[PDB]
Each structure stands twice: as C-alpha cells, then as structure tokens.
Amino acid sequence: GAAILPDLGTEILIPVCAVIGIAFALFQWLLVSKVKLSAVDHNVVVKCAEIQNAISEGATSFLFTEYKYVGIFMVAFAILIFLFLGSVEGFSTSPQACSYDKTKTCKPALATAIFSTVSFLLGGVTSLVSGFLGMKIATYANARTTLEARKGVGKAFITAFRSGAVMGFLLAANGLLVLYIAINLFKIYYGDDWGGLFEAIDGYGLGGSSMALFGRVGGGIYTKAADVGADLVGKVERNIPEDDPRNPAVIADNVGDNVGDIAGMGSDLFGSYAESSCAALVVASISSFGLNHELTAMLYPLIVSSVGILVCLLTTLFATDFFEIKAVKEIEPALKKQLVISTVLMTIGVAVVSFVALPTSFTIFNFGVQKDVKSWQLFLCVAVGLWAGLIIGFVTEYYTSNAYSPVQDVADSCRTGAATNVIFGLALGYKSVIIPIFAIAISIFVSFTFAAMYGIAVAALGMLSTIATGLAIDAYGPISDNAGGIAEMAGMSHRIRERTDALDAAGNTTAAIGKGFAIGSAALVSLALFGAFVSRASITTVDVLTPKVFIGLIVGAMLPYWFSAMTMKSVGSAALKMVEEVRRQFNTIPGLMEGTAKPDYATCVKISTDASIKEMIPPGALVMLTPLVVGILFGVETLSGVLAGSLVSGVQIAISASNTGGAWDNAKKYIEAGASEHARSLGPKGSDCHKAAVIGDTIGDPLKDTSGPSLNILIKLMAVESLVFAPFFATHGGLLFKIF
Amino acid sequence: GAAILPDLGTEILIPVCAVIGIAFALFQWLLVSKVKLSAVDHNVVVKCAEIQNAISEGATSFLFTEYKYVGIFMVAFAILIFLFLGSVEGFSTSPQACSYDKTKTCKPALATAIFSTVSFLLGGVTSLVSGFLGMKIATYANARTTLEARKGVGKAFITAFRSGAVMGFLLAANGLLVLYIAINLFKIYYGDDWGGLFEAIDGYGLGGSSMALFGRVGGGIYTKAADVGADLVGKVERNIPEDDPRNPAVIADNVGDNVGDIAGMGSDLFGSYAESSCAALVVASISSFGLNHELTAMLYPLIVSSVGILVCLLTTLFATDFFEIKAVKEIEPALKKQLVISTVLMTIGVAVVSFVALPTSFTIFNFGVQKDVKSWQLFLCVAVGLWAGLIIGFVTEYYTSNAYSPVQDVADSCRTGAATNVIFGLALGYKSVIIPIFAIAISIFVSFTFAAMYGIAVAALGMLSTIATGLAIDAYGPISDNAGGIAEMAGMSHRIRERTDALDAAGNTTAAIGKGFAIGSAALVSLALFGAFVSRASITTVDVLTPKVFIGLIVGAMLPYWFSAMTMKSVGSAALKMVEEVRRQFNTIPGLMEGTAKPDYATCVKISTDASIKEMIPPGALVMLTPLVVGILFGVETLSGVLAGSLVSGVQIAISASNTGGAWDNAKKYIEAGASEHARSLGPKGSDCHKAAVIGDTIGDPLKDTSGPSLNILIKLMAVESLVFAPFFATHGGLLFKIF
Ligand SMILES: [K+]
Ligand SMILES: [K+]
Ligand SMILES: [Mg+2]
Ligand SMILES: [Mg+2]
Ligand SMILES: [Mg+2]
Ligand SMILES: [Mg+2]
Ligand SMILES: [Mg+2]
Ligand SMILES: [Mg+2]
Ligand SMILES: [Mg+2]
Ligand SMILES: [Mg+2]
Ligand SMILES: [Mg+2]
Ligand SMILES: [Mg+2]
C-alpha cells in the first residue's frame, strides 16, 4: 500500500535535504573564513599560520600515502568481489527466476556481481572523501580556533563547533546523496528486480567500512606513536609543557589528531551510516515495500536521514546563535544539549516520517515468512535506537568527564602512584559497559520483536539519525586539541592555553560519546546483517549447540583480542622508537632544551608514518580475511558462530577500552587545570600525581585511539562482508567438511 | 554391555587409589617434617620459625573469618536449593514419571531437592577443607623451604615440590573419595533411578565452586591489597628490598600468598574437578551406562581420576627421587617435565581404562536421541582434553616465563618507562589467548562430534586427569614465594634470597599455567553443562537469532566485565588505603626506617581483612544471583543466551588478564635477578627500569590474582547453578513473558 508521500515527492525530498545540508556546511565554513590569518599581535598571528601550515602539510602528506596503499587494496579486493560473486553461477549471463518470487524473472547473478563491485568502489571512494574533507576543515579551523581563544573560551568554542559542523553536515549529506544517486542509477538496469538492486547496493557500506578499517588503524598508529613519545619525554622526563615547540614529536602529535581522530573517525562513521542504510534496504527489498515496488516506503531509511540533516541544522543554531558560552563549566553542557535537543527534535521528525512515508500496515521479511508489521511499530524501532544512543551518551559522559566522581577518583588515585591510577582506570572502563549493553539489549529486543532484522537495521539507523550533530560535537574536539597545541607552539599567553585546555577536555568526553554511538550502532547493524546472512546463506537454523556453530562462536569472540594485541603492540613499539628519538634530540642537539635551537620534527613524522603504513596491514588482513578463510574452509554455519561471537565479545572490549582511555585523559586534564581544591592538591604540573596521571593517559592513548574505536569497524565490517559473500560461501565454501 | 572390569572391581579400585593418594601425601609431609625448626645458624632458624608462626597465625585467622561468612551463606543458599527444587512438584511426596523417560517411574522430585541440598553442603565443606589443608601444608613448608635454601636450589626445590605434592594429592584423593562415598550412599535411596541419583549428586560441584568463588575473591582481595601496598611504598617510594621486615604490609603480603594463591586456588580447582566429574555423570546416567545400570562404565570418570592419582604419583617420583637440580636454569624445565611426563603416562592410562572399563559399543544421550559411540572414540574425547591442557601449558609458559622473548621484550620496554611496560603487557595478554582458544575449539569439535555433552564433559575431566601433578607444580609456587619472604624477614644471606627468587620466578609461570588449565577445563565443562541445561529445561533448540536468546547472549558476554570492574576496583581502593597506612608508619614511627623500632603489622592485616570480607560479597552476589534473576524473570531461553555469552566472552578476559599479570611479574623478576647482561642492563634494583617493572607488576597483581583466575569460577558456577535449577526455571520461570 502506498504512503501519503508519493514516490516522486521522495525522489525530490532526499536530494533537496542533502543539498540543504551541503549548503549549511559551506555557509559555516564561510563564517569561519572571517577569522583571518597569514604567514606573510602580528607576530602571534604569523606564528599560528606557520604552525597551521606545518600541520596541514603533514596531514595532507600522510593521507595521500595512506590513501594510496588503501586505494590499491580496494582495487585488489573489488576484483575478488567480482570473481567470487560471479563464480556462484559460473559467470552465466542467463536470467533466472527470482528467489523472492518464482513467478518472476530476475537479472543474472553476474550483474549483481558487477554492480556489487561498483557500489563497493563507490563506498570506498566516498569513505576516503569523508576522511579527507574532515581533515581539510579540521586543519583549516585549528589555528582560527586558537586566535579566537584570544577573545575568550566562548568565541573559540564557536569556531571549533561551527567547523565540526562543517564536517558533520558534509559527511552526512554527501553519504546520503551518493547512496541516493547509486540507487537511481542501478535501478535503470535492475528495473523491477529490486531484490537484486539492493543486494548490489549493499556493497556501498562494505566499501565504506573496508577503507575505514585502514584509515582508523593507520591513522590511529600514526597519532598514538607521536602522542605517547611527545608526552613521556617532554612531560614525564624533561619537565616541559605539553606541546612545547622544543619537543621534536609535537608536530607529529598534532598532525596525528587530524589523520586519526578526524580522518579515521570520519571514514569510520561513514561506514556506520552506509551499512545501516544498506542493511535496511536489503531486508525491505524482499519485504512488501520492495515486492510491491513502493519507492517511498522502500527508501524509508533515506527519508529518515534526510529529515535528520534538517533536524541537526536546527539543533546547530541553538549552539551557534541562540546561546553564548561565558564560562568553562558551560562547554560540556552545551555539547550535551546538542544531543538532547536533536534527540527530542528527531523523535518528532521520525514520527512525521513514519506517518507520511509508510502505509499503516505492511509485511517484513522474517526468515522466509512475511511478518505483519504496523507503521507505529517501525516508528518505535527507529526511536528505540535514537533513545539508546542518548542513554549511551549520558552514561559515557558520567564515566569520562572530570565533572563526575568516577574520573575524579581516578585522578585522586594518582596520589598513590601510577599503578593505582591504572588499576582505577581499568576498573572504570570495565564498569562503564553495563548500561550501554543494557541499552543495546533493550533496543535489540524491541526492534527484533516488532520487525525482525529490518527493525534492527532501522534501530541502528535511528541511533545514527542525528549523525550530522554527532559528528559536529565529535570533530569539535580534535580541532580544540590542535588549538591548544598551536597556542603552546606559538608561545601564546597562559590564558590562551587555559581556554583551549577547557575546550579540549570537553572534546575528550565528546570523543568517548562518539565512540559509544559507533559501537552501539555497530552492534545493531551487525545483528541485522547477521540475520540477513543466515537467510542469504540458506541456513535453516543457527543452533549454538552444534559443533560447527560453537567453534565459530568461541573463535569469533577471540578475534577482538587478537586484533587488540596487534594494534596495542604496534603503538607500543612505535612509541618506544619515538621516545628514543625524542631523547636523542634533547640529549644531543645543543640549544634545544634552552630554546636556541630548533628540533627536527620531520624525523618524528617519519617514525609514525613508517610504523602506521606498515603495521596497519596485519590487523586489516585479520578482519577481512576471517570471513573468507572461515567461509571457504569451514562454511556458513561456522561463520555464523564467528559473527555472533565477534559481535557480543568485541563490543565489551571496545567500550571498556575507549572509556578507560577517555577517563585517564580527563583525569590528567583535571590535575592540569586545578579548577578546585581537590584538583589543586594533586598539582601543580610536574608533581608526582600529575606524572602518574600522564602515565595513565599514555597507556590509554592506544586503547581509546587505536584498538578501542577500531573494534566497531572489525565487527560491522565482517558482518557486511559475510552477507556480500554469503552465496559464494554457501555454494563453494565449507571445503574441509566436503573433503572429509 | 558390561566391560572387562566388573562392578565390584570398580567399587574397590576407586577408594584404593584415593587412599594410596592420601597415603602418598602423608608420606611427603613426613619427609618434609625431617627439616626441623622451632621458636624454642641458631638465631636464623629461630627467627625463621617466629616468622613462620606469624604467617601461619594470620592465615588461619583470616580463613576462619572468611569461612565463617561463607558457611553462613552456604546454609542460606542450601535452603534456596531445597525450596526452589522442591517447588517443581508442589513438594509432593509421590513418585512421578522420569523426566528422561515418561514410560518409567522415578523417585519424587522432592527427594532430589533434598539430596541436591545434601550434596551441595558436602561439596561446600570439601571445598573449604581443600583450601584449608592447602594453607596448612603451605604455612608449614614455607620456612622449611627457606632453611633448606641454605644448602642450594635443588634442596629447597624438592622441599617446596614435595609440599606442593602434599596439597595436590590430598585434594585429588579426598575429592575423589568423597564423591565415591556420596554416590554409594545416594544409591541406597535411588535404587534403579540412576538419573535421579546423579542429578542429585550434581550438587557436589555446585557446592564446591560456590564456595570457591568467595575463597578466590576474598583471598584474592586480601592478598593483593597487601601486595600492591607493600611493593609500592617499600620498593618504589622508599627504596628498600621486597619483603623487608621494616615494611608493615609484609606479613599481610606473605599471609596473602597462602590465603589467596593457595587456599582460594585449591577450592577453585576442587570446583573444577567436581563439576567435570559430575557433569559427565549426569549425561551418562541417562545414557546406556545409566539406563542399563552398568556401574563400572558409569563411573568411567572416577576411574580416570583414580588412574590419574597413580600416574601422577609415578610422575612425582621423577622430580623427587630420580633427578636433582644443580642449576637455577633447571627449575622451570623440571616443572614442565612433570607436565609432559604425566600427560604421556596418562595417555597410556586413559587407553587402558577405556579398554577395560567400557563396552566397545554403547549409546550416549544426545538431545533426546541415544547416539552410538565406540570406546576408542571416548578415548579420544578424554585424550584431546588432556593434550589440549599440555598445549595450553606450553603456550602459557612461552608468554609468562622470562626465558623467552615476549616477557624479555616486556622487561625491555621498561627502558622507556612504566607506560610502555604496561602497553606491552596488555598487548602480550591479548596475544596469549590465540592458541589456547584454538586448543579449546579443537577439543570441543572432537569431543562434541564423538560423544556430545558427555564427550565434552569427559574432555574437561581429561584436562584435569593429572590434577594432582597440576596442583603440585602450582602450590609449589607460593610456598617458594613465602620462603623468599621469610629469607628477607630473617635477614638471611643475600645468596638465600637469590635462590628463592629463582624458585619464585618459576612459580609465577606454573601459576599462570594452573590458571590456563582452570580456564580450559571451565570452558569445556560449562559447554557440557550448557547442553545438559538445555535438555533438562526442555528447550527444543537454542536459536541465536531469537530476541530472547540474543539479549541473553550479549548481556551474558558483559557479565565478566562487570565482575572484573568490581574486583579490580576493590583491590585499587584497598591497595590505596594500604599505601597510605604504610607511609604513615614510615613517616611517623621513629626508628622504623632506621631499623630500631618495630612496625605494626596488625594494622595492615586489618586493612586487607576488612576489605576482602566486605568486598567479596557483591561479585559473589552477581554470579550467584544471575542464573536466578534471569531464569525467574526471563526464562530458560534467555538464560541459555546468558550461559553461551558468559563462556565465550569470559574466557578471553580471563586468559589475557592472568597472562598479562604473570608476564609483568616475571619481567620484574628478570630485572631483579640480573642473570644476563640484558637483564643487568635494566638494573640494578631501584633503577628507573626496575621501578617501571614494579609498576607493571603491581597493576598485574589484581589482574592475575583477583579478577582473572576468579573468572573461570564465574563461568563454571553459573553453568551448574543453571542446570541444578533448570526444572524450577522451566516450570516457574519466565515470569515477565507470562505476565505481559
Ligand atoms: K579528543
Ligand atoms: K606465584
Ligand atoms: Mg597527549
Ligand atoms: Mg591529541
Ligand atoms: Mg593535544
Ligand atoms: Mg584528549
Ligand atoms: Mg593523548
Ligand atoms: Mg609483590
Ligand atoms: Mg606473593
Ligand atoms: Mg612475594
Ligand atoms: Mg610472583
Ligand atoms: Mg605480586
């Protein structure tokens, strides 16, 4: 049954919304361009511009190198997709009867193999663009945030936030537009074969997350090598300020914020948005929407996202135009209010979309059967994802902000040395998983009960319906981070660093929240994708108490630990190298420590470049080889276990790692700031307590910036990879069992 | 089909072996008594005995206190077993159809509710006795190991190993004898109802692990509060030797070794032994062995354990009589030979038992169907468990001994400070899980394929078939640990401390191996119990892709993290208080640092005492309340998800935690001994590298001695607890779904 909103209306609405989002991004960039600087107080302005250029150059240079390797891997893997999918039906060009309707004829499997390859490359390119554009605005907005900090913490906040909004709206609108275009283009070939249309379109998220994996891990290793090295020798050893221009690692550190926390994060969340959308589309395509060719209801997830962009635009105006920050204590609540307002506004918006873009009754594919579903039930499916997100955001704030007791007790434990700081920090992260898990569990139960895998996929999208705002508050952080780095490097007044420090602490919490959203939506979309895989692979039942499934389960649960071992070890080894280099320069360049000789920044940049480009390979291979090795050797039943295991296990370590690291960072910020008697009693900077906090922070660096956040990609990527390769595994896989 | 060994032979063989094992343990205690000392070099022996008495008193005092609370808890919980199990049949006194065969009449459920309570209390008491006896021999042989260290390493090794043997054989023999006795007594009532007999007997393992959970957590919190406190103030802050008698936390530290690493560990492994034996018994009881009332084959597990005692006795003779240690490098291989020799001899033993105590063909219950199994197939089930163990031991030795690169690299990373030491340590533990998981997975596949749940249960018992030797090599460690503590506290020669340090380092490795066997066997037995739970609860299929099972799965995966948060935070807070107290004594008691005034040990003993008794409660509650809360509220489908996720997730954090902790300890021992130039280059004691290693070591302390090893109990305990209450949950549970 047709919805109120006709198909042509949907066809107009979606790109209009994307255009509006792109326009809004450009406008914000324009407003930020009003902050002027150049390399040609004149001296402070000039110095900021020079440091900005060093950072910009370093960041652009790394991504080109990273993206060159990743893009080569992408072409290699696209060929694998083509051959494996094509081999299912012997590359025949002959049409076959639709698996979703024997009375109809569908396009050849071969076409789906081709178009899956196309959408995969599309997703990879779009994901690269997401990270690059993010890096561009971040490296443009950093120094401008620094200069605005001369006028106060509120002005600086607005520059960093407007700029964060540039990234969020660009990424959400571009991701939406590309998907919309691909669908209309692919439809020209597929015609009424919507099952094949959307199965092919599903490659988009596969490409998105494939590149995101390397961007997150590569970017992650680069930044943490520099970060740990700079901080340990500078702050713990040499008793100099963080980001001091004498420190040879400071440039790599600040470049790192852009290539990891920005570019990597950007590709990462694009993968999230793409997979959730695509997962909804596949299930709907063989549900009544796709069967009755009802375009509007079929594109329900895209309409939700179209409205999300608009909702986030309005929300943004509240922080950008309706409220002023005057005191440091107002930053975190400002940020939180963006999550609150957008959620409330999006609840309404989702109700509107459910009311006008769905028929009141319809059916959803449910493991071979068409399940009767009502539109108010779908509304609750996406709304439960939306509200799970907000809950995750609140709990994550409680655990990572130095405004609350958990982080303050972590800082407090520094009184008894680094070891107690680490014990308290590990305990905090472990403890922090409880409510997000419960939130995710509730979201699963509601959405699974109402609309099976579609409901779940649409819950994932619900959690990411406010993605423009999520990205904005998140990207705000590394920009603020760079601003303090630039302030120190340019020798600005201590008042400037205090303001940036306030901004930066809030970004710590905000980064932990973004990670919570990414993990939450990854669990959701991966479960949806798990169910879809099972159908696509002709599995009747995934029975945990069979030998094949159970070994998959316990092995899948182990993968996130293997992945974490590799990434942690990489950062550890590179940082060890970094410390040796930094020590060397301090110990052997005359005048360096005295400030009359300049350090060699390039050598540190090279160390984090070499380690990242090299060491991103094995964990990337682990994730993407796993479904192929398990699918081909052991078959779809064992692979089923693996998917379930990696999901339920990976999620726990991802959450605890990110929050522990976030907590160590803000525990350190708390001591550095001395904004209360308790904080001051832990100081001043350089005290044993401070140094214990720095130890904790640097241990948390790879936890929250390399392994932790990348785990959500491990999960969601194997999930979509297995779905895309399901027919191939079902037909040609399980060799070990076929032999014996 | 009867086997070659008649029922009467089996009835005689089992206690004969137990008694032999008891005799052998007593013989060893005797040879150890040959080493003489008394508080009535003369002044060294006297001081050694006054110190031994101080430790013995503190350990006995805490155990009584701890056991007081646990026993009280044990009685309360026993009342729940009676009521809940009794409620299944409305406390009827009438017989009813067999749950395994409705054509037959069985003993009333109410009877089984009573015999379950009896076996529960029996197991609890036997678990208490297990811990207590271990503590007795350990606090007896510690000073004897010290005094004998005056004559060389070999001499001190033997005393420590003989004493470890006492605990290993007493525990194994006693655990067997009690089980055997309880089976014969219970059979008096049950007659031909063997299903009901062994269903009731299954309470034995429930009592054993229930009470072990508190013993591992309570003892673990006690010991680690002292350990972290003593080491941070003494070694990191005040630059004095480890175990220095001036340190007021040193008595609590050394008491703790016996109270956690010995008593808690002993209960822990008794729990492992009992659950494995019992789980095999419940499946077999409704297989052909139980239905045909063939006593020999039905007691296959107890006959395996009986031959295990004999094999281990033979194995012990090799380290004890046939060989001796001249060089410290011979210690670790000596202990590993115990594992290799016992594994090989037991392979032969299990072959013989399989050949003489089983019919060549029989059936194994398999989710309703009687499955045809051959004796050679059962042989491989127990053998694959046995060999999985040896593999796990080798891999664990590789990751925790400082004779190999991973630990040496971790020690090396100390050159760049505590933060790199910690990052490397975390990475190592994450890495160490790969092969054990694979070993476990292979064990599952083989045993599940051949003989379903019975096969898996029997793989679990195979891994624990050399439990006496396993316990010997492990218990050897803390005895050595204490011996070095006594050496330092008695101001003995530096050369004495060097010898015990060598003994101690090996003990760290064997303790990590012990934990691996416990985690390996816990995975196996819990999977077997899981399957049995599913049958007993009348679940047709555990379908991962249902709302009820999946929310169980993800939540159950979260539980080990929640458990770790509690236990890590408890140690952190307790250790923090300890540090403050030790500082207080050093800063306010005149003459203390100088050596002319005595420190108040009692205050430190009180800190760890108070913290442990209080803080053992909530994690105990979490583990014990979970099956009841989920089973009653959500039902057996959800609890099924919980059990699966708990197992596959908990195993990863358990292995990684114990091995990380072990690694940091031995990295530290490596630097402390300086037995190579690389080791010496990181020294000497008090260096920045040494201090960085001590930081890592004290972070690892709660990881490997509180949270990590208790995690295996969390898994195996919820597993039996679920099976025992299965009829109850199946009848009266799932309330939330029955209402709305
Ligand atoms: K940040
Ligand atoms: K030990
Ligand atoms: Mg830093
Ligand atoms: Mg940074
Ligand atoms: Mg920074
Ligand atoms: Mg930060
Ligand atoms: Mg950092
Ligand atoms: Mg210690
Ligand atoms: Mg100790
Ligand atoms: Mg010790
Ligand atoms: Mg030790
Ligand atoms: Mg220790």
Curated annotation (Swiss-Prot), chains A, B:
Question: Which UniProt keywords are given for this protein, alphabetically ordered?
Answer: Disulfide bond, Hydrogen ion transport, Ion transport, Magnesium, Membrane, Metal-binding, Translocase, Transmembrane, Transmembrane helix, Transport, Vacuole
Q: Where does Mg(2+) 4 bind?
A: 508, 665
Catalytically driven reaction(s): diphosphate + H2O + H(+)(in) = 2 phosphate + 2 H(+)(out)
Q: Where in the cell is it found?
A: Vacuole membrane
Q: Outcome of residue 716 to A/R/M? A: Reduces pyrophosphatase activity by over 90%. Abolishes proton transport
EC number(s) given by UniProt: 7.1.3.1
Highest taxon of source? Eukaryota
Annotated Gene Ontology cellular components are: vacuolar membrane
Cite the InterPro entries for this sequence. Answer: PPase-energised_H-pump
Q: Where does Mg(2+) 2 bind?
A: 227, 701
| Topology, Cytoplasmic side | 138-160, 223-260, 321-328, 400-421, 480-508, 577-605, 664-706
- Chain segments annotated as transmembrane: 8-34, 59-88, 110-137, 161-190, 194-222, 261-286, 295-320, 329-356, 376-399, 422-446, 453-479, 509-537, 548-576, 606-634, 636-663, 707-732
| Entry's Gene Ontology molecular function annotations | diphosphate hydrolysis-driven proton transmembrane transporter activity; inorganic diphosphate phosphatase activity; metal ion binding
Reported regulation of activity:
Inhibited by excess pyrophosphate as well as excess Mg(2+). Inhibition by ATP, GTP, and CTP is reversed by increasing the Mg(2+) concentration. This suggests that the substrate is a particular metal complex such as MgPPi(2-). Modification of Asp-257 with DCCD abolishes pyrophosphatase activity.
Query: Which sites bind substrate?
Result: 224, 704
Chain's role: Proton-translocating inorganic pyrophosphatase that contributes to the transtonoplast (from cytosol to vacuole lumen) H(+)-electrochemical potential difference. It establishes a proton gradient of similar and often greater magnitude than the H(+)-ATPase on the same membrane.
Q: How does it assemble?
A: Homodimer.
Misc. comment? Has few direct interactions with pyrophosphate. Interacts with the substrate via divalent metal cations, such as magnesium ions, that are bound to the pyrophosphate.
Protein family: Belongs to the H(+)-translocating pyrophosphatase (TC 3.A.10) family. K(+)-stimulated subfamily.
Domain remarks in the entry? Has 16 transmembrane helices and a large cytoplasmic domain that contains the active site.
Name by which UniProt lists this protein: Pyrophosphate-energized vacuolar membrane proton pump
